[PDB]
Amino acid sequence: DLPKSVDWRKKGYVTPVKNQKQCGSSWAFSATGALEGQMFRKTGKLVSLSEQNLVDCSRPQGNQGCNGGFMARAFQYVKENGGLDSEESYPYVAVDEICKYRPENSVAQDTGFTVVAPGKEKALMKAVATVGPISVAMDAGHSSFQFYKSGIYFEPDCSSKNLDHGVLVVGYGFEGANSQNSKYWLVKNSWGPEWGSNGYVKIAKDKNNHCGIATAASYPNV
Amino acid sequence: ALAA
Ligand SMILES: [Cl-]
């Protein structure tokens, strides 16, 4: 079966926490996090990827820069575009700018993406355990989420269907001794290391798709 | 979503 807990940060698949600042680009941070773990799995090298590359160039795939977007449209762009640059070559400035995509600076590629059956937390558990970090959307429009600090986050006002924020599941686990209760998803956010728990949040797991975490999960195929 |  599947492991009782997984934490890809402990295996070198995850870069330090980033900060999207005042730009609606969480979708891009989620998409680069997932691509960063897959390229690492494939090559053994961890390289920070460019969210800016995505914000500036994927309008054709249906993204809207700092006005919003979707992780699947971003993997679609890296595939149609044939590549994606590093952060070091195409830095993040948090505003919509001129597409400056440079093929010679590409450090990642993907042939498309795989989707996790919507609403299926156990399908998600399976993808996290066998693939690596997974891009997911959640409902983060809540004061308790803005002010989150520690523990398992559970917010009654959360929706599993109306989502507004893209994040990355880097693993899952539980608190205590019974591996079957008090479970949580380990999630990397893009509001800087200062938000939450060093930039992460534990979201209640197997509690009816809390905050929509398994409503729209996907990962790139490299 | 954006940080407050
Ligand atoms: Cl956003």
Author numbering:
A (entry chain AA): 1 to 222
B (entry chain PA): 444 to 447
Give the text the authors published on this PDB structure.
Addressing the elusive specificity of cysteine cathepsins, which in contrast to caspases and trypsin-like proteases lack strict specificity determining P1 pocket, calls for innovative approaches. Hence, we set out to determine the crystal structures of cathepsin complexes with representative peptides of cleaved substrates. As a working model, cathepsin V was chosen because of the resolution of diffracting crystals (up to 1.3 Å) and crystal packing with accessible active site cleft.
The pattern III group (binding shifted to the primed side) consisted of structures of eight non-protected peptides that all bound uncleaved into the primed sites. Electron density maps in the region from P1′–P3′ and partly P4′ of molecule A enabled an unambiguous interpretation. On the non-primed side, the MPD molecule occupied the S2 site, and the CL- anion occupied the same position as the carbonyl oxygens of P1 residues in pattern groups I and II. Its negative charge appeared to mimic the absent negatively charged SG atom of the reactive site cysteine. In its absence the affinity for the negative charge, as manifested by the binding of Cl- ion, prevailed over amino acid sequence of peptides of group III.
